[PDB]
Amino acid sequence: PLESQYQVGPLLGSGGFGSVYSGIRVSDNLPVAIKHVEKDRISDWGELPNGTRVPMEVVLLKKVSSGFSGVIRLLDWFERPDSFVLILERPEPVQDLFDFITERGALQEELARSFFWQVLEAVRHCHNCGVLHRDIKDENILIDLNRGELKLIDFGSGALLKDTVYTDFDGTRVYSPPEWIRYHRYHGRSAAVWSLGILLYDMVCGDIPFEHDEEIIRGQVFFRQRVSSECQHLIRWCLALRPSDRPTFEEIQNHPWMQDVLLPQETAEIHLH
């Protein structure tokens, strides 16, 4: 059923998230990724509309599926005796944002603007579908290099979006907000905005702004690269220590730095091709 439907290619990556392989859908040759997660390693469980016990990522990915290409699409999934297997759409050629930044250094602001805008659109889509990602970071963003389109991946640390406090977290610590560090408590949207400020800093500076818990808590941002005043302002706003001082998604997208974004295709033409 699974092994016959897909041609497994090379391992793309493995880590806390499981193991992800390149694959091809045999039926039509569609490029896919094949993600294996061991059952014992599964953090949160959910249940399907028809009531079947699945990894939360499966629940979350089904919730965000539509014609919108900003979130990686779940094509199918399978249960094995000791693991789940997720079939994801795979852009080709593709490069994660982490590698892209590594090789190119800090991104030109025009490019960071286009990329950050697309991430914001993807995250808003998740939130609008009642899904909180909880691990927004450069390693969880794929770049469709031909189309200039970014895709959010890995909902393995995600949760249903709620308006009450979260007291669990298993995303990436250096992207996690000061309230999580200090109090083990955060709200979904304002924690997301914090991680987005970390991400935006990462794009325009070539590295994350904080490494140690103490730096996260202090929230003092130092710019190691030349970054425009308007970009700096937005970053510092996203990284407000008090969650209620952070911009809403609407406020981020209305920020002067965010105006006149390139289209994804223009972005690929100017910056990727």
Ligand SMILES: CC(C)(C)CNC(=O)C[C@H]1CNC(=O)c2cc(-c3ccsc3)cn21
């Ligand atoms: C950039 C790559 C060469 C693809 C390597 N990255 C990963 O394997 C990260 C891994 C993290 N967790 C995931 O859920 C995940 C999905 C994918 C993916 C999805 C479509 S192509 C690759 C890749 N991942």
